[PDB]
């Protein structure tokens, strides 16, 4: 019964194309992820899992699956549209976002992640392209998967948000992997530029150590016993302070960033604890007791600041 038109191309993958569209029933803008049923599959397993996942997750800061459409030749997942991703948002402000708004975006990111982590969902591929933001200022987590998006177009960002302990063969694939990426997104919102833009596993680890400093048995118990680190022979860097690099962070902000960017996942501040960090004290007591399904903008003391 509810039908849709395609308006524009948002992203394109191997098996799927994502279109911007519009409901003919409601006039609401949607995203239509159309998956080609080339082989005699029914629906492909990936789509079934994506759908079963997004149906079980109900949170204001996770993208909302609105509808599914099956024809003989395609399966289309219909998501509610949001106006921009974070990178587009940055770009529309000449890479200088209102710091109050940065606080709101970070908070909402942390709210969505905390829910995911409570449902045992590791995101594992956080990056600006996966953070969608609407006119109202609501931020929702996506995973575009493949879908290469339609000047910052087509940048290879594969490793930029990857944590150094995982890049050196840690087997602790916990929700804390995301906490490192949160850190990297925070810096990028705060400065408009990526924190650790490495092309290789070796150079990603390098760039990291150029800011955080080279590890030791103090800063990383058992690090010199690691064979891969032993081989990756880096010069001993002295830690630069994060606050100099990102002056727009207050000392609370920089303190939160440092707690996110711990070499090892065991020691990073969690999403839940990060929401209680003093950095967010300006947003009040009410925001912490909101239902999962309620926008933080329901609070009225939460408002988006005009952007330049
Ligand atoms: C400017 N506006 C726009 O460009 C724009 C574009 C737009 O299009 C889409 C947005 C999101 C999705 N889908 C998802 O995000 N899926 C998802 C979320 C998660 C979470 C819950 C882990 C985050 N896991 N998986 C998810 C889960 C399982 C998967 N299995 C295989 C492959 C992928 C998978 C993804 C989509 F298909 C199209 C919507 C609004 N605005």
Numbering used by the authors: 162 to 311, 317 to 474
Task: Tell me, in the authors' exact words, what the paper reports.
The crystal structures of monomeric CDK16 represent the first structures from the PCTAIRE family of CDK kinases. The predominantly α-helical C-lobe contains the CDK/MAPK insert, which packs against the αDE and αG helices, as well as a PCTAIRE family specific C-terminal extension that stretches behind the αI helix before folding back to terminate beside the αD helix.
In contrast, the rebastinib complex has a canonical αC helix that includes the PCTAIRE motif, which probably reflects the additional interactions this region forms with the bound inhibitor. The rebastinib co-structure displays an inactive ‘DFG-out, αC-in’ configuration. In this structure, Asp304, Phe305 and Gly306 are flipped into an inverted conformation relative to an active kinase. The activation segment therefore folds antiparallel to the β1 strand and occludes the front of the ATP pocket. Rebastinib forms a total of five hydrogen bonds with the ATP-binding pocket of CDK16, as similarly observed in the equivalent ABL structure. The carboxamide-substituted pyridine ring forms two hydrogen bonds with the backbone amide and carbonyl of the ATP-hinge residue, Leu243. The urea moiety's nitrogens also form two hydrogen bonds with Glu211 from the αC ‘PCTAIRE’ motif. The central phenyl ring is sandwiched between the gatekeeper residue Phe240 and the flipped-out Phe305 (DFG motif), providing strong π–π packing interactions.
